[PDB]
């Protein structure tokens, strides 16, 4: 299994999600 490639797409997924759910929170807080 390409374990490194998986870690990279882990970090990328986490990053997307912290960014997206983060901004979604801010959206509703300002709504």
């Amino acid at each position: 299994k390409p374990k490194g490639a998986l870690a990279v797409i882990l970090v990328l997924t986490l990053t997307i999600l912290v960014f997206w759910l983060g901004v979604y929170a801010v959206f509703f807080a300002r709504g």
Binding site: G4, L12, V23, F27
Partner: protein, 546 residues
């Protein structure tokens, strides 16, 4: 090999544009850190009248001129060298000259404070006709490039009936056809509107139509910036890393998606514009999320290939492959670091695309935070790395150990400055600091931003040093006396491909068809809205407010 000389001319002119464009960035970083260094800059560069003139130059020279010259260098030369065929030289030199000429023409009013619009030059803000004219000529240079590469591909296909297009040439064909569709928005906006208006021929321009036409090009132009770096990242970097590209088909699929999805999306720059129906904003929003796919895809293909290389080179465990990679080679380091910063870059872009979430970040410092990660860091760093393999190939000039070490410093400093700046800009942007603002001249206006403002000051000083080291570096390699013809004669370090199911590759090679589809999508996504707007034009007078 007269294509080497023309390629060289594109790369060097690009790099000159990037250097001059970049002079203004530390000043702008300092400004987003509440520090006014403009008086110093106007001592050194007395023709500069305002922060905004600086900002136009920076935008135009870095994001338009450099990126284009790079694209034109890379996506002509590489396919030519993979096919082992000579580009039409009279055409190649023609494109360089259009590029140089349109650059000199747009430069004159820019340097003389007659076009302090931005790089978006939004009507009714009205610049000097020479700005529009020269920018036009500069960008049409690319239609010649498209021709050049279409020719090469047909000459090849003819000589090799029944074969699939080789990888790099496949990349370049789909890339240039994408860019041709994409560019029609701006050529439309320019020809029907900006030019006549700047010439005095019509009184006003409809700002909404101007913006809609603009952003037709304004999105896919950033994929036009990226894809040259991707071609490198895909077909070259796996060799430099010590491995191979893990899949030719996955690399074609990514590029094919860019062809299909790069252009029908521009309303994502217009989530805050009046007069555009929300249902269309949602359609574009979805289409924008889809265009994130070839990069999600790229993330995995490229990550697996670097891991592969690292495993070949002896690394083991979950991080050993990282450690095992050639971190002493700036040509490997520069794109890889760019890729790392592309993770938060693309996360921010996915935020910008969600229709409603854009109201949080739109026109704030968030957006420069997103894009410096994408273009000022990944594309630029990848171009910077090509110094260390592309240049020797083009010139026979050797890279000394000293120069290799300096290159490592530039590439890490440049990367680090861009990460630090990215934190300062995202965060300031979340605090509501506007982009495109001489905010240091209102020092008491953004008190809640004091913390990310420290990051911008730092970033500005780190990127000043990175840039000064780049200039000394770039000129060391260009100005050195020696020429060893074994560097000039050596092959481009094209990767080998681990192998490919042919079904998929054949389908993807029906380029005429995919091109037609891409063209239909643009009609479906832009037709209805442009027909309504063109039916209801409200042209308005122009203004100089500088």
């Amino acid at each position: 090999y007269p294509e080497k000389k023309a390629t060289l001319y594109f790369l060097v002119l690009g790099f000159l544009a990037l250097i001059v464009g970049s002079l203004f960035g530390p000043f702008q970083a300092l400004n987003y850190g509440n520090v006014d260094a403009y008086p110093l800059l106007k001592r050194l560069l007395p023709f500069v009248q305002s922060y905004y003139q600086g900002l136009t130059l920076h935008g135009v020279l870095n994001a338009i001129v450099f990126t284009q010259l790079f694209a034109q260098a890379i996506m002509v030369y590489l396919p030519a060298r993979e096919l082992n065929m000579r580009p039409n030289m009279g055409l190649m030199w023609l494109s360089w000259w259009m590029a140089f000429i349109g650059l000199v023409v747009a430069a004159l009013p820019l340097l003389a404070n007659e076009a302090t619009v931005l790089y978006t030059f939004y009507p009714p803000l009205k610049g000097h006709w020479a700005f529009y004219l020269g920018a036009s000529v500069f960008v049409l240079s690319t239609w010649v490039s498209i021709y050049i590469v279409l020719d090469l591909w047909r000459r090849w296909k003819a000589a090799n009936p029944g074969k699939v297009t080789p990888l790099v040439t496949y990349m370049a064909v789909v890339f240039w056809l994408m860019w041709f569709l994409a560019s029609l928005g701006l050529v439309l906006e320019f020809v029907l509107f900006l030019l006549p208006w700047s010439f005095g021929l019509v009184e006003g321009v409809d700002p909404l139509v101007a913006r809609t036409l603009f952003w037709w090009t304004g999105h896919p132009i950033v994929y036009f910036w990226l894809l040259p770096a991707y071609a490198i990242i895909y077909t070259i970097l796996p060799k430099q890393a010590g491995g191979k590209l893990v899949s030719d088909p996955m690399a074609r699929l990514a590029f094919l998606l860019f062809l299909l999805l790069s252009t029908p999306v521009g309303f994502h720059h217009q989530f805050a514009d009046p007069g555009i129906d929300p249902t269309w904003k949602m359609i574009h929003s979805v289409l924008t999320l889809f265009v994130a796919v070839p990069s999600l895809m790229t993330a995995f293909t490229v990550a697996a290939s670097l891991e592969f290389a690292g495993r070949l080179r002896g690394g083991r465990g979950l991080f050993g492959w990282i450690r095992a990679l050639p971190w002493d080679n700036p040509a490997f380091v520069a794109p890889v670091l760019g890729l790392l910063g592309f993770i938060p870059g693309g996360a921010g872009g996915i935020v910008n695309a969600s229709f409603t979430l854009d109201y949080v970040v739109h026109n704030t410092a968030w957006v420069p935070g997103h894009f410096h990660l994408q273009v000022a860091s990944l594309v630029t760093l990848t171009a910077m790395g090509s110094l260390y393999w592309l240049l020797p190939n083009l010139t026979g000039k050797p890279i000394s150990d000293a120069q290799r070490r300096l290159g490592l410093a530039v590439v890490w400093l440049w990367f680090l400055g861009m990460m630090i700046m990215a934190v300062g800009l995202h965060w300031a942007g979340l605090l509501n600091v506007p982009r495109r603002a001489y905010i240091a001249q209102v020092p008491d206006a953004y008190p809640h931003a004091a913390v990310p403002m420290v990051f911008n000051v730092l970033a500005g000083i780190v990127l000043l040093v990175a840039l000064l080291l780049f200039i000394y570096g770039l000129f060391s390699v260009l100005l050195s006396r020696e020429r060893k013809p074994e560097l000039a004669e050596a092959p481009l370090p094209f990767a080998e491909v681990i192998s490919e199911d042919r079904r998929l590759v054949l389908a993807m090679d029906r380029i005429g068809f995919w091109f037609a589809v891409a063209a239909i999508l643009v009609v479906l996504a832009y037709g209805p809205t442009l027909v309504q707007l063109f039916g209801h034009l409200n042209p308005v007078p122009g203004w100089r407010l500088w």
